[PDB]
Amino acid sequence: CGGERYLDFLRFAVFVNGESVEENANVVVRLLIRKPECFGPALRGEGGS
Amino acid sequence: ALTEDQGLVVVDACKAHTKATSFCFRVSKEKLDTAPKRDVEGMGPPEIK
Amino acid sequence: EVQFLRTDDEVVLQCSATVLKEQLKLCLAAEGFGNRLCFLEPTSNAQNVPPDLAICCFTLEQSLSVRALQEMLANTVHRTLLYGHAILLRHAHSRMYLSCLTTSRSMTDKLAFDVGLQEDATGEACWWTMHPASKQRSEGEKVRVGDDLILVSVSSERYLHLSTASGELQVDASFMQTLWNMNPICSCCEEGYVTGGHVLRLFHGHMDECLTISAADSDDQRR
Amino acid sequence: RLQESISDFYWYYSGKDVIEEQGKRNFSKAMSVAKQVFNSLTEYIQGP
Numbered sequence: 001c002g003g004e005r006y007l008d009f010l011r012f013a014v015f016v017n018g019e020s021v022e023e024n025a026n027v028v029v030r031l032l033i034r035k036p037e038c039f040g041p042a043l044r045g046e047g048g049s
Numbered sequence: 050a051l052t053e054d055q056g057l058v059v060v061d062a063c064k065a066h067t068k069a070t071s072f073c074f075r076v077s078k079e080k081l082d083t084a085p086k087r088d089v090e091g092m093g094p095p096e097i098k
Numbered sequence: 099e100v101q102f103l104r105t106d107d108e109v110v111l112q113c114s115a116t117v118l119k120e121q122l123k124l125c126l127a128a129e130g131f132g133n134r135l136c137f138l139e140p141t142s143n144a145q146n147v148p149p150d151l152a153i154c155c156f157t158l159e160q161s162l163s164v165r166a167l168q169e170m171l172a173n174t175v176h177r178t179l180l181y182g183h184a185i186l187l188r189h190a191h192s193r194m195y196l197s198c199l200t201t202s203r204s205m206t207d208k209l210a211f212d213v214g215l216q217e218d219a220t221g222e223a224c225w226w227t228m229h230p231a232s233k234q235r236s237e238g239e240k241v242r243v244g245d246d247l248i249l250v251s252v253s254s255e256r257y258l259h260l261s262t263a264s265g266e267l268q269v270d271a272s273f274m275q276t277l278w279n280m281n282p283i284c285s286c287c288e289e290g291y292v293t294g295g296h297v298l299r300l301f302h303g304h305m306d307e308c309l310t311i312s313a314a315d316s317d318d319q320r321r
Numbered sequence: 322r323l324q325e326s327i328s329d330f331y332w333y334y335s336g337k338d339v340i341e342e343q344g345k346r347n348f349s350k351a352m353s354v355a356k357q358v359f360n361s362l363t364e365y366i367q368g369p
Contacts, residue, residue, distance in 0.1 A: 030255060033273055045207040058321045059311070067145040090243070091099060098290050165332035173336060238325060 108283035130192025
């Protein structure tokens with residue numbers, strides 16, 4: 001529940017209006033995979049599941 | 050290397066003893082060259098050509 | 099020593115991870131002709147087994163900025179290094195350019211392109227950047243002798259990592275971090291002088307003879 | 322830092338032969354500051 005309601009802010013900060021802001025998407029994508037312990041690392045392919 | 054039982058040979062790197070494999074380049078083979086010193090991590094002074 | 103490394107200086111990677119006993123020193127190496135992927139040569143235990151430095155050495159070519167690299171690669175057809183610069187590393191023996199690959203191994207997803215020599219410099223996947231790795235140094239500062247740092251591929255966002263996987267401590271471009279240290283080797287020296295690591299002939303007399311071994315396919319072992 | 326900043330800014334318009342109006346103002350802003358820094362350094366040395 002905590003993770004689902006936490007990244008919803010980023011969903012609004014990267015999809016401005018029907019488009020993808022390249023000035024922030026590139027930074028966000030790097031940060032998502034900067035730490036492997038993200039996006040539910042237990043069962044998202046990071047931990048091997 | 051010098052195997053101390055067959056003379057000067059060439060040995061594999063797997064069993065390359067440090068004392069046997071170690072050699073030296075000098076001049077005027079007599080006089081019993083003194084102990085090494087001046088451990089400088091630079092290019093060093095001019096040497097043989 | 100300020101470690102100028104004025105775009106012409108041999109360098110070797112000297113990073114390792116504390117795995118077996120004391121982070122045994124491993125150096126990145128490759129042979130080129132044959133398997134393109136790089137491997138690791140132990141070097142701390144040089145007394146029992148000598149290291150293989152013939153194919154382990156690397157040389158430095160360019161130290162341009164990120165924007166300078168972008169301009170150069172957009173328009174194609176002696177100076178000290180500065181922290182946060184694009185780097186160009188070549189294999190000394192096989193004369194190939196150190197780069198990354200487009201394939202992975204280990205059967206896990208774990209997106210990590212293999213590190214291997216490239217036939218030609220062009221391809222946008224050859225350069226690396228020495229990014230800040232410790233608080234002791236800062237972006238825009240110089241580089242010192244034996245200064246640990248992190249190398250990031252220009253194309254692959256993943257760092258250059260010593261992937262201590264189930265194998266024999268492979269090197270893979272995964273999104274981990276390890277302080278890759280660089281140690282220097284011979285540089286601009288006197289013309290016609292002896293150097294450690296030079297393949298040489300020991301000649302006696304004008305043209306009398308030279309140090310040799312028995313020819314190939316000899317009756318006795320070539321010892 | 323200012324010298325490195327302007328040098329990096331130089332490797333942005335090198336390919337292009339036309340400098341935009343926004344780029345012209347930014348160049349003037351940095352150079353007008355660099356001159357002030359240079360004058361301050363001179364006053365530390367004059368009167369030797």
